[PDB]
Amino acid sequence: DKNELVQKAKLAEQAERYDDMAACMKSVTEQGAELSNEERNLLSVAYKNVVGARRSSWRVVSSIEQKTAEKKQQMAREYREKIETELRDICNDVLSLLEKFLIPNASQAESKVFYLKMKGDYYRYLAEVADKKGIVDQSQQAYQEAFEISKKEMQPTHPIRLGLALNFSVFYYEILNSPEKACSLAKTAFDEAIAELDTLSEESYKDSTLIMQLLRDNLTLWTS
Amino acid sequence: DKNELVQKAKLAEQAERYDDMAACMKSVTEQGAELSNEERNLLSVAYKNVVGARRSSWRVVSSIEQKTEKKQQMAREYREKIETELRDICNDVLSLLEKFLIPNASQAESKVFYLKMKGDYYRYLAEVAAGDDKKGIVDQSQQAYQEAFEISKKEMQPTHPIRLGLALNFSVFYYEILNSPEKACSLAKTAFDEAIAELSYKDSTLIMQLLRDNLTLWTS
Amino acid sequence: IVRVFLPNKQRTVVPARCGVTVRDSLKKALMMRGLIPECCAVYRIQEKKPIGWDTDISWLTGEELHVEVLHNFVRKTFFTLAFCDFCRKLLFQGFRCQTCGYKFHQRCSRDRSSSAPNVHSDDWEIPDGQITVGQRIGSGSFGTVYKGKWHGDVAVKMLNVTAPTPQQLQAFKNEVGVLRKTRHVNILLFMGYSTKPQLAIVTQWCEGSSLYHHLHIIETKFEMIKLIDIARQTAQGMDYLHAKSIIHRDLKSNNIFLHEDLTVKIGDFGLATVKSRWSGSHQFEQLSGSILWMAPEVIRMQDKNPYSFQSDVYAFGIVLYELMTGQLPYSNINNRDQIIFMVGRGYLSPDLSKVRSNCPKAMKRLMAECLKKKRDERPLFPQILASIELLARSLPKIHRSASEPSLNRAGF
Amino acid sequence: AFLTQKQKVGELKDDDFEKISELGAGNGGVVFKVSHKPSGLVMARKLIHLEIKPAIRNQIIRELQVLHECNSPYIVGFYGAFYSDGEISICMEHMDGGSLDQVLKKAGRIPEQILGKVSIAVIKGLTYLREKHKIMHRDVKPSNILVNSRGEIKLCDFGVSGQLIDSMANSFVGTRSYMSPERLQGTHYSVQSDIWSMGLSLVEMAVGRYPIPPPDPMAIFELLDYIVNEPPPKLPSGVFSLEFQDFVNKCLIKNPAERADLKQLMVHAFIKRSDAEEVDFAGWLCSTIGLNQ
Numbered sequence A: 001d002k003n004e005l006v007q008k009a010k011l012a013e014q015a016e017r018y019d020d021m022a023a024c025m026k027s028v029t030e031q032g033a034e035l036s037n038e039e040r041n042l043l044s045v046a047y048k049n050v051v052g053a054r055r056s057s058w059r060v061v062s063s064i065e066q067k068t069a070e071k072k073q074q075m076a077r078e079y080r081e082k083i084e085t086e087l088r089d090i091c092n093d094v095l096s097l098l099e100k101f102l103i104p105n106a107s108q109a110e111s112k113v114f115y116l117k118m119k120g121d122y123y124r125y126l127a128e129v130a131d132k133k134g135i136v137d138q139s140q141q142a143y144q145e146a147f148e149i150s151k152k153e154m155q156p157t158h159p160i161r162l163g164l165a166l167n168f169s170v171f172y173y174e175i176l177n178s179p180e181k182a183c184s185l186a187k188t189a190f191d192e193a194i195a196e197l198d199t200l201s202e203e204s205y206k207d208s209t210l211i212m213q214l215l216r217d218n219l220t221l222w223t224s
Numbered sequence B: 001d002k003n004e005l006v007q008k009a010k011l012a013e014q015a016e017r018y019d020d021m022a023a024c025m026k027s028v029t030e031q032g033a034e035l036s037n038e039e040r041n042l043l044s045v046a047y048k049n050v051v052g053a054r055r056s057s058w059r060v061v062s063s064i065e066q067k068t069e070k071k072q073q074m075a076r077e078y079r080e081k082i083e084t085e086l087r088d089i090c091n092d093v094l095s096l097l098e099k100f101l102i103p104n105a106s107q108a109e110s111k112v113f114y115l116k117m118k119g120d121y122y123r124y125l126a127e128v129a130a131g132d133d134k135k136g137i138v139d140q141s142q143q144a145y146q147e148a149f150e151i152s153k154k155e156m157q158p159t160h161p162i163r164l165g166l167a168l169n170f171s172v173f174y175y176e177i178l179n180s181p182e183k184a185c186s187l188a189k190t191a192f193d194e195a196i197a198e199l200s201y202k203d204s205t206l207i208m209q210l211l212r213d214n215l216t217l218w219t220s
Numbered sequence C: 001i002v003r004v005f006l007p008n009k010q011r012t013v014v015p016a017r018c019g020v021t022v023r024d025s026l027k028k029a030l031m032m033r034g035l036i037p038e039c040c041a042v043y044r045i046q047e048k049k050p051i052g053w054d055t056d057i058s059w060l061t062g063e064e065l066h067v068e069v070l071h072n073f074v075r076k077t078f079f080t081l082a083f084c085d086f087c088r089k090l091l092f093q094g095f096r097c098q099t100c101g102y103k104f105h106q107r108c109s110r111d112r113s114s115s116a117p118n119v120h121s122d123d124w125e126i127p128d129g130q131i132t133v134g135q136r137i138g139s140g141s142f143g144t145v146y147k148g149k150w151h152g153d154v155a156v157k158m159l160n161v162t163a164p165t166p167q168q169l170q171a172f173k174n175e176v177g178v179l180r181k182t183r184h185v186n187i188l189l190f191m192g193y194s195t196k197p198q199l200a201i202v203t204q205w206c207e208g209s210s211l212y213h214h215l216h217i218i219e220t221k222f223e224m225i226k227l228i229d230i231a232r233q234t235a236q237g238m239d240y241l242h243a244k245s246i247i248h249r250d251l252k253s254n255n256i257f258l259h260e261d262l263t264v265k266i267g268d269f270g271l272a273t274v275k276s277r278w279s280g281s282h283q284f285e286q287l288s289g290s291i292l293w294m295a296p297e298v299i300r301m302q303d304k305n306p307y308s309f310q311s312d313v314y315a316f317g318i319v320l321y322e323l324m325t326g327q328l329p330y331s332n333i334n335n336r337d338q339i340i341f342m343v344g345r346g347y348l349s350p351d352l353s354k355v356r357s358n359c360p361k362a363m364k365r366l367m368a369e370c371l372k373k374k375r376d377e378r379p380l381f382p383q384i385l386a387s388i389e390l391l392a393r394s395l396p397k398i399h400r401s402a403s404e405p406s407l408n409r410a411g412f
Numbered sequence D: 001a002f003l004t005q006k007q008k009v010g011e012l013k014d015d016d017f018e019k020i021s022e023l024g025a026g027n028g029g030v031v032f033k034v035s036h037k038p039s040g041l042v043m044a045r046k047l048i049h050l051e052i053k054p055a056i057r058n059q060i061i062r063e064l065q066v067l068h069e070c071n072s073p074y075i076v077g078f079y080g081a082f083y084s085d086g087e088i089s090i091c092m093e094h095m096d097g098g099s100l101d102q103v104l105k106k107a108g109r110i111p112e113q114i115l116g117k118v119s120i121a122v123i124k125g126l127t128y129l130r131e132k133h134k135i136m137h138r139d140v141k142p143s144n145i146l147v148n149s150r151g152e153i154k155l156c157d158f159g160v161s162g163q164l165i166d167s168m169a170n171s172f173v174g175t176r177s178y179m180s181p182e183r184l185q186g187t188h189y190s191v192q193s194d195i196w197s198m199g200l201s202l203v204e205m206a207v208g209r210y211p212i213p214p215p216d217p218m219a220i221f222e223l224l225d226y227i228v229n230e231p232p233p234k235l236p237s238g239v240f241s242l243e244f245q246d247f248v249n250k251c252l253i254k255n256p257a258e259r260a261d262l263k264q265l266m267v268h269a270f271i272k273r274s275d276a277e278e279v280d281f282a283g284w285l286c287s288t289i290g291l292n293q
């Protein structure tokens, strides 16, 4: 079952067929057992493209709404609330998934912070989509808890912590509109990355630097 | 209303989600109403893209299928359900063609492009079908291509984009499916030269470059 | 203390040690400038001899070095015009970089082949008299506009050949025959020309101004929504001009006149008979005008005809470096012959560090391709137009700041 | 002892100038001559145009006024500049001899005897520029040395507005460049640059031939390839003295370390031999240009 399910994902990943992979990872994670590293990132990325494709589509539909009668405006509206409903469904499946199974069974500290970042990231998606303040506050709570736990265990250059900080800064900027705090957190994260950038694991070598780049671009774009 | 349907179609056009507009295009022309050029073009691209994604999945899963056995057999039922969905996708639009588009083509350029689309879709089911039905699908594409190929020369320009596109698909049909590269290249050459002698523009030169490169790789 | 330079001439002194490679030591500075130490090259001089990154500092003590430039691959299936960038073919399914936007196929780094793409007299020699000569308008590389008044708005030019040979005059009647058919929305109308007076190139007249005026006189710097649309409307116009093999060969920021900030018009091009002056009976081309908008090969003039379709693409890399930064390249060198010798020899190229902060990293592999030292590498205009169409609509998708991207997702 | 005065001028405006004729055709700019009704005297009107930022051109204009303190019988005087027609109107001292490009193209060649005096004049003029105003000529060219039929020779068109040095660098095209290799490879060593720029210029005057194409046309870029890749040219012997070769050779060395400074250029014997003998210049040009007194 589990091996068959991860194979049905490894065969749906290469094929760009993303809904099948989302529907299979959900089934493999509702098993109630722990998710080791290989299925972890698979579940994460699966849901990542599923929600992000709809988010990008919603962005374009909203852009056309900004780029404009009583019918030409309206047609964009039904499409945007349709994409809104479907993205809300897809994010609700995962958030309920972590609350029911993933977070309570997070044995490892890195797994705990990883799932917490996932949780906060989806609530950030709902926050951008949308009463409204509840989602943004809950996302802030999830991000704050993830940061607080991640401050202890793993090496300060770790991809989970780095992406968590970058997401958290994006949250301060695009929702709460706190650019000063966003640049502050991103800046400290980046400098501590430089300071701790000793000899590093080859496995995380590429990805750590890849996140550090995007960190630098947020700093540079937010300087102005 | 037609305007609302086409508006939804082009709203989904840049959405990177194409199944929605592909499904709405069915409702646009299931009335059998007359088709103008633009709505026909979105009609073409939508299912073209849907079959494109399905066929890309087909190619990759066929690659792992050819890679090997416990893991390989999973790719087999994955493959067959992708093929089934693909087959319904092509069959819906083909039934649309043989009920409201092809028997309702009025102008010269209507018949040629719709016949090209019908032959192309039949070719799409042809890449997958094997056994006795495979030859039937291939034959049903043969005359579909020929009917438009003969109409093109007599009724429309040597440089108009649909003729170059039809020549391109007709040529590639002879290579990968028909396993007859000689007939493919011998016709691609002619289709290249009548247009180049008689040389709205970017699309034309694009197909021209594809014909040159396609001649090149067949000559290999 | 081993001092090493940086792009934009920044200075950093890495510590001198023994046993540890330059990679992780210089890594701090390269990341503060955001450069991976695997895509960089450093130089030691005993002009500039490259050295790798696995060198101990024991031999590098007391040496000055330069830092100059020389990927996560998800799978995707492109749904519109998308051209491979390793074989320059047409790509439909294949990989893609998450941020750098460089699209390629595994086969080019029983196989399948290509397919259809996703689709989507009246003019004659202007006679004298009726051509009302304009007024003092300005100057440029080889002439001056004269705003004509004949049944509309037109422009009149003057040229640097006074009494050419009749066989040159027939070549002129041929060049107008091949060049007046430039019917486009990105090219102003070509009414004709008057050869009874001093030889003239009659064109239309456009309001507003050129691009050089807009970006170095008013300096009304736009947003990327218009910054990419300008390059799109110019790439389309220089693709129509390249389909029938007529090289513009004069692409400058001061000849792309745009009206009302919506319409973009390009003109003042070609004239291979007036250029390549007929001092005898030859085609000896002359170096007249500005210098930043032509390639190292055009500067060299080492061939009888060193132009190509490519040397009109490097002239696009300069006009795009101009649009992005807002300034011209080589605005720091307080010299002229230094600029000529430098761009010719190839020891130095326009500096990429001076681009803006909101620079779309996907175009960092387009406007960089448009500016190679070599000529066989810069892409022809259809691929530039496709790669600009791609992110002319993919901009609202990345209209936000950065975010955590997906994983490696590439296996070999 | 020369009594150069320029206070007679007042307000300057295009409506107050009536054109007379043109001095000639230059390389970068075109030189005019014009009449001013209040002043009466003739001016050398150098008109150049640069479509540049109004703030930048205003920055250049008030900086151009420093020539009012840069007065000497060795440098062309400055009558005054102003803005109209959108162009830079650099009024100058109108000298009937023009420059030594017309004298070159008319007389064919210049003897070493005239070179002896003109070398002293140019070296002391550039020394006056440097040791006084801490800025150098940067443009030592045969076409930028103005002369008159009164027995004087003078310099003009140095680097007077630093912003304009680059605002002009993209519009001064020319076809001839005596540009010093130390100013070509990518660094600036201005102190020794003008010595090279004058050493090449004097060879041009003496031989009458563009020396970068070796005697014993070439493309614009390839000239620089010759300047900055292979050893420099050398003046022919025989018709020119060996002690003059000893002067020219130290003025045309690539490496600035081997280049001798200005002080050495005044401790030389040939430079002090040139002024030892006297040369008539009033009738010299009048016997080859047709002018009088």
Ligand SMILES: CNS(=O)(=O)Nc1nccc(Cc2c(C)c3ccc(Oc4ncccn4)cc3oc2=O)c1F
Residues within 6 Å of the ligand: C334, C335, C336, D046, D067, D075, D076, D077, D078, D090, D092, D137, D138, D139, D155, D156, D157, D158, D159, D160, D161, D164, D165, D166, D168, D169, D172
């Ligand atoms: C060409 N070599 S360069 O060093 O790169 N650039 C330049 N070098 C020198 C000069 C220039 C340009 C230049 C010119 C055209 C000029 C002309 C007359 C003038 O007024 C005046 N009045 C009295 C006496 C002497 N002049 C002042 C001038 O100031 C300039 O800077 C370079 F642009």
Ligand SMILES: [Zn+2]
Residues within 6 Å of the ligand: C084, C085, C086, C087, C088, C089, C104, C105, C108
């Ligand atoms: Zn390829």
Ligand SMILES: [Zn+2]
Residues within 6 Å of the ligand: C071, C072, C097, C098, C099, C100, C101, C102
């Ligand atoms: Zn990349």
